[PDB]
Each structure stands twice: as structure tokens, then as C-alpha cells.
């Protein structure tokens, strides 16, 4: 206490934002951070006292989110559900729901399973101006909400950089190389 | 075995199994490839000795 | 392939971590068996 207070004058604090940024900058539906100050402490504490803290804005879960034009931060971490984009034929003027959670059984589209999982990832309801073949994102991490922007390559590289992912890929590679070695030594 | 022997008891990170029923994608197909190969093997060998 | 398809094909149960860790160890436990089998096959041929 006294020893800490002696050196507390020179101590400098550091920001708590690391590798996450600000959610309100990259994501709508999230109000900017607000500093709430407590009221004066209650004179008497009663067993039936509810909180007296200032109220906080409550945003309900949207049924679906619009197409955020190249600026899409997932509300929660989704299941990857594949590192390759789908090549799907989208009809002009037809409303499509894109699965953001990634647990949909109906391919890239929402189905209904986002309501059966604890996540804030809501489907991206979008409409294309012209029918044609589009690269629908299947890793659920692309900045383009329903489309692929080659983020899955970065995801694969990051997975390979991790210790466990490095071990997994090298183990699969050595399994295949063992098969190849057996095929090469089949005549000895 | 390691997982169930090290991380599935109550005092070591159990799981809240919230699934009512299973929904599978070609279950038996994966569980019958390994036996079928065996069958093939056995059959072939028998035929040769026969 | 399709990660979601291959992560719940086995009766909606997830054993993918143990499957992934199985290849690395399984890449080396077969070497003594393979070499002694080579020896046995050569003996049978002789």
C-alpha cells in the first residue's frame, strides 16, 4: 500500500484495446462506448433493493442484417464450415439469406439453425442486381458479407502458423508420404 | 481414450450436451467402409486358397 | 473438402481433433511392422 503509493505517481497506464479494435467502428447495431458513472451509495441496504445504476441501451437481436458493403465484422465468432467459396448461381431480384453462423445444413444459405445456437450472427439478407455465378463466402469471415474476398486464404495461413495446426498439416503430409514411400518400396 | 480419461469427468471440463437428437450426414457410410475393406481382403484370400 | 459436412458425418459427433492428431502418430508406428513384414515376405519368397 504505502510502498505502492510511493511509486504510484510515476506509473503510466496502457490502453486495453489489443487485437480487437473497436466494435462500433466496424459494426453497426453496436452503440459507441459510454462511460457510466455510479450514483451516490445508498444510505441503507435493503434485501429487496434493485440496482440504481444508470440504464444501458438494449439492442435486441435483429432478425437479419443488411448487406454491409465490404465492411462486415461478425457479431460473434462463426464456425468456419469450409475454407473454400461456393460458386452459386444467383437469380436477379431474388432475396437470398446467407448463413452467418455457419452451422446451416442448407449449404451457404441460412436455413433456420441460427435460432438454435447461442450466437449474434444473423443471416445477411441480400439481393443481386444481375443474375449470374457468384463466389458465396463459406468461411463466414469475409469483409464482403455474402461474397468471397479471399479471406479464407489468410485463415488457412493463420491455421498453419499455429503450433497445433502446423502439427496437424505435417502429420497429414507424413501420412501421405508414408503411403508414397510404401508405393515406392513396393518392389523390395 | 486420453480425452475421456483426462478431460471428461465432472471435475475436469465436462460438456453440457444440449443436443436432443442426432442429425447425421451419411453416418453408416463412414462406419462401413473399414469393415467392407476387411470383407474384400478376406474374400480374396479365401478364393486364392480355394 | 467441406469442413461442416465432415465434422458431423459420424452420427453428429465430433472426433475431428483426435482424427487430426491421429495421423502424426500413425505416420511412424507402422515402420517396425512394415520392415519386419518386408523381411517375412522375402523369407517366404526364398
Amino acid at each position: 500500500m504505502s510502498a505502492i503509493l510511493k511509486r504510484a505517481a510515476k506509473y503510466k497506464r496502457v490502453s486495453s484495446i489489443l487485437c480487437e479494435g473497436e466494435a462500433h467502428l466496424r459494426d453497426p447495431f453496436t452503440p459507441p462506448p459510454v462511460i457510466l458513472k455510479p450514483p451516490a451509495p445508498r444510505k441503507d441496504k435493503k434485501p429487496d433493493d434493485i440496482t440504481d445504476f444508470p440504464a444501458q441501451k438494449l439492442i435486441p437481436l435483429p432478425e437479419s442484417i443488411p448487406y454491409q458493403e465490404g465492411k462486415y465484422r461478425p457479431a460473434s465468432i462463426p464456425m468456419v464450415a469450409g475454407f473454400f467459396p461456393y460458386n452459386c448461381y444467383l437469380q436477379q431480384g431474388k432475396v437470398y439469406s446467407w448463413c452467418s453462423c455457419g452451422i446451416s445444413q442448407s449449404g451457404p444459405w441460412c436455413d433456420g439453425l441460427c435460432n438454435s445456437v447461442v450466437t449474434r450472427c444473423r443471416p445477411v439478407v441480400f439481393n443481386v442486381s444481375q443474375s449470374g455465378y457468384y463466389k458465396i463466402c463459406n468461411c463466414k469471415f469475409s469483409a464482403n458479407a455474402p461474397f468471397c474476398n479471399n479471406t479464407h486464404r489468410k485463415m488457412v495461413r493463420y491455421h498453419h502458423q499455429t503450433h497445433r495446426g502446423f502439427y496437424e498439416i505435417w502429420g497429414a503430409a507424413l501420412f501421405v508420404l508414408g503411403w508414397v514411400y510404401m508405393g515406392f518400396n513396393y518392389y523390395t | 481414450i486420453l480425452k475421456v480419461a483426462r478431460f471428461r469427468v465432472l471435475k475436469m471440463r465436462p460438456k453440457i450436451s444440449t443436443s436432443y437428437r442426432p442429425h447425421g450426414k451419411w453416418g453408416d457410410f463412414l462406419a462401413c467402409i473399414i469393415p467392407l475393406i476387411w470383407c474384400i481382403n478376406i474374400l480374396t484370400n479365401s478364393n486364392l486358397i480355394l | 473438402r467441406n469442413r461442416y459436412w465432415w465434422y458431423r458425418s459420424l452420427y453428429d459427433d465430433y472426433v475431428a481433433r483426435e482424427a487430426k492428431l491421429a495421423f502424426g502418430i500413425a505416420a511412424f508406428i507402422w515402420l517396425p511392422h512394415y520392415y519386419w513384414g518386408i523381411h517375412l515376405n522375402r523369407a517366404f519368397e526364398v
Binding site: 510404401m182 508405393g183 518400396n185 513396393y186 518392389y187 523390395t188 | 475393406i37 474384400i40 481382403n41 480374396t44 | 512394415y34 513384414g37 518386408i38 515376405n41
Partner: peptide, 7 residues
């Protein structure tokens, strides 16, 4: 079978 004897 195909490569049952492996060698």
C-alpha cells in the same frame, strides 16, 4: 487385395 501384402 490390391496392396494387402504391402511389398
Amino acid at each position: 487385395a490390391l496392396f494387402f501384402m504391402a511389398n
